[PDB]
Design a protein around this ligand. Structure first.
Ligand code: HEM
Length: 455
């Protein structure tokens, strides 16, 4: 039948906006979902969206004939620096399909064969950092995973070394990028965005956007002048042509793609590695099984591509970490035409839906009643997973283009971590999830004990 959907508390002309005036808005939405169910209405002044938490409704939302990717307010704000790169373009914008057609083969699993040596280069730097800590010291887990993922995308992205393991003070590029992201998210909570108060905020924003462009613009410009060819995405974008239009990407869009690769993949992949290690130390039997596979499979000083492919249980560990805490926890859709969702909720052309992925992944009609448990063996048989039940990489043609890159990196790095060290949760760490663009376990720290295996 036609059902009216619930809606959390409203505050006059501010509507539900005050409910996200928190440092952890996604986690606050998960609680509201718990309280209200599989769908609820959320309004802000001038805006409406419907938050979806059940596989039954989300599978319909994932029907591309009915729904397409929406640029949420958050993505509209990130667009001020990511431009018409793949992540912040409408599906119907010409530069979305051109960039997509040109870059997709460069992100295939086969393409990872090509990036593997550079990924191994930064992974080795991580392991050697940890090999060199003094016995009284400890590891700052999300910080080190972020040094790793940023450096890996820079090196495979455009043959540039950020050298994050050589410095605590971030590259000025990284400083401005992180700061631009913080401002874009902070903007979502402002009722009066134009108060003079936010005036220096706007100021720093344009300075940050200039730091980013001038580095990336200069890198592209130098590469074109030198004519060098490398095993990186930038070479691909300068030589590639869209078979459909027959056109290449221009230099401005290439810059937006490179800025996009840095933002969109660095924080998500580091958060995945951080959550994976969290769950492993909280579940010592799972850690043991993973480390035994790593020891069995990674028989060389240097892992090969083929060996990484053999880390099946490590892969399951990662997918289960993605199930419980998908680090890009939500994506937005719009109805292409009038349609009725689940036989109960009529939608008009243009209406926005938000997929709350952590809630989806806790649907007990799909995963059983132990959904809060960390159990990698859930992924032992992939075919047992219903379509649209597991979506940490989004949906359809607008799904993550970096998925193979992220999982190859994370599988390699976690495999090497487990090969070379035993880990201690020395502080009995209490999970604290910080929210930016993405999710990550803030203050997560461990001590490692080297297994004394050389590289
Ligand atoms: C574990 C890590 C990652 C997670 C969970 C993840 C998640 C996602 C999700 C949820 C989407 C869809 C967003 C939407 O519908 O609005 C997406 C988009 C995208 N991701 Fe990732 N991402 C990850 C790693 C990467 C990496 C490593 C890169 C790049 C090197 C990357 C580049 C992109 C791009 C370019 C898009 C847009 C695709 C398009 O619309 O054409 N991501 N990602």
């Amino acid at each position: 039948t036609i059902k009216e959907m619930p809606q959390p508390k409203t505050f006059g002309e501010l509507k539900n906006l005050p409910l996200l005036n928190t440092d952890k808005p996604v986690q606050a939405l998960m609680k509201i979902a718990d309280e209200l169910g599989e769908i609820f209405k959320f309004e802000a002044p001038g805006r409406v969206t419907r938050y979806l938490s059940s596989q039954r409704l989300i599978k319909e939302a994932c029907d591309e004939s009915r729904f397409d990717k929406n640029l949420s307010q958050a993505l509209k704000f990130v667009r001020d620096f990511a431009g018409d790169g793949l992540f912040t373009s409408w599906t119907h914008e010409k530069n979305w399909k051109k960039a997509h057609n040109i870059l997709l083969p460069s992100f295939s699993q086969q393409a990872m064969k090509g990036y593997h040596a550079m990924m191994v280069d930064i992974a080795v730097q991580l392991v050697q950092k940890w090999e060199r800590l003094n016995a009284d010291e400890h590891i700052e887990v999300p910080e080190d995973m972020t040094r790793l993922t940023l450096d890996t995308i820079g090196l495979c992205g455009f043959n540039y070394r950020f050298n994050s393991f050589y410095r605590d003070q971030p590259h000025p590029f990284i400083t401005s990028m992180v700061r631009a992201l913080d401002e874009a998210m902070n903007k979502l909570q402002r009722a009066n965005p134009d108060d003079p108060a936010y005036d220096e905020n706007k100021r720093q924003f344009q300075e940050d956007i200039k730091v980013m462009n001038d580095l990336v613009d200069k890198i592209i410009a130098d590469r074109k002048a030198s004519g060098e060819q490398s095993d990186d995405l930038l070479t691909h974008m300068l030589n590639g042509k869209d078979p459909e239009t027959g056109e290449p990407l221009d230099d401005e869009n290439i810059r937006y793609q490179i800025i996009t690769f840095l933002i969109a993949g660095h924080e998500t992949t580091s958060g995945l590695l951080s959550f994976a290690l969290y769950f492993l130390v909280k579940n010592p039997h799972v850690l043991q099984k993973a480390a035994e596979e790593a020891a069995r499979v990674l028989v060389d000083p240097v892992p090969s591509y083929k060996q990484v492919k053999q880390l099946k249980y490590v892969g399951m560990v990662l997918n289960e970490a993605l199930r419980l805490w998908p680090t890009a926890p939500a994506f937005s859709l719009y109805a292409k035409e009038d349609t009725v969702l689940g036989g109960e909720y009529p939608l008009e052309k243009g209406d926005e839906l938000m997929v709350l992925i952590p809630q989806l992944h806790r649907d007990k009609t799909i995963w059983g009643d132990d959904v809060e448990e960390f159990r990698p063996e859930r992924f032992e048989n992939p075919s047992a997973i219903p379509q649209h039940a597991f979506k940490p990489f989004g949906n359809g043609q607008r799904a993550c283009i970096g998925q193979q890159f992220a999982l190859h990196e994370a599988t390699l790095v976690l495999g090497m971590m487990l090969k070379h060290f035993d880990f201690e949760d020395h502080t009995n760490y209490e999970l604290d999830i910080k929210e930016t663009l993405t999710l990550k376990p803030e203050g997560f720290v461990v001590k490692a004990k080297s297994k004394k295996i050389p590289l």
